């Protein structure tokens, strides 16, 4: 009947930002007011659309992307941003129309000694295009000499682990993000 936003937000496991998930949302009427009225979301940014007018609008393609980043990196999930997440992990277009939702998940994604299940890409030969996704693990060549599949000097594994710990500051605490894209293209 209604849109299954609950399965996105209430998911037990979340993806790393480099391998960010995505679900289609279509052929359903959504109750967005139950989401942007909840104080559990410390970050609820909507771009190119009034949040209180979401139910008065119909869209062609509505996607729900979810991943986990550190608190200091939620700033990069926004139109026209730069940084390791915006460039090498998850890029939003300048004409992006939708909402960005993020909440602190320290009690779920941290552990004493470090949670290593979440990673993010720290090196890449070029920036990503909007909504591109790269999941390669090729050794990144910083210098001029080729690496030949051996990690070392100027030869890095491209993915960095967060190592989430509960005693970290909120900037380095885990945050789960959900990006609702509202695209008004030419389609039924």
């Amino acid at each position, epitope marked *: 009947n209604l849109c299954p936003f609950g399965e996105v937000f209430d998911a037990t496991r979340f993806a790393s930002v480099y391998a960010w998930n995505r679900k289609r949302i279509s052929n359903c009427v959504a109750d967005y007011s139950v989401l942007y009225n909840s*104080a*559990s*979301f*410390s970050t*609820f940014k909507c771009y190119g*659309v009034s949040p209180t007018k979401l139910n008065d609008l119909c869209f062609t393609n509505v996607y729900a992307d979810s991943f986990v980043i550190r608190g200091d990196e939620v*700033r990069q999930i926004a139109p026209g941003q730069t940084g390791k997440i915006a460039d090498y992990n998850y890029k939003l277009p300048d004409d992006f129309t939708g909402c960005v939702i993020a909440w602190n998940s320290n009690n779920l994604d941290s552990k004493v000694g470090g949670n290593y299940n979440y990673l993010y890409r720290l090196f890449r030969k070029s920036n990503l295009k909007p909504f591109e996704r790269d999941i390669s693990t090729e050794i990144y060549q910083a210098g001029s000499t080729p690496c030949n599949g051996v990690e070392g000097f100027n030869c890095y594994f491209p993915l960095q682990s967060y190592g989430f710990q509960p005693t970290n*500051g909120v*900037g380095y605490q885990p945050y789960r993000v959900v990006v609702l894209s509202f695209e008004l293209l030419h389609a039924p």
Partner: nanobody
Amino acid sequence: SQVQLVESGGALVQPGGSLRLSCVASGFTFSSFAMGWYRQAPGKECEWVATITITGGSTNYADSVKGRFTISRDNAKNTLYLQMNSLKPEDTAVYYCNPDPGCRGGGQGTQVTVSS
């Protein structure tokens, strides 16, 4: 970037005193964003204080400040407020406001000292 956040209203106050912090925001549609207050003690780490929704209809507060602090917004002025009553020495920190998490939102923050 374009985001600019100006916090103010802090001072040196005795315990039990009251204070009201302001945060004038610019560079983004303030009326379509959730807002949060964050603080950092000089030797400790940045921590979350309070959160207010887009419409201001609901709020949320850290346990150490619940009952004493109040967060409010005035979309007509692009300003976020934090009313700090019954100030305790544990509230001594630099306070930041930020639609994103943490103390690195780009603003200088406001200093609050509850010594005396």
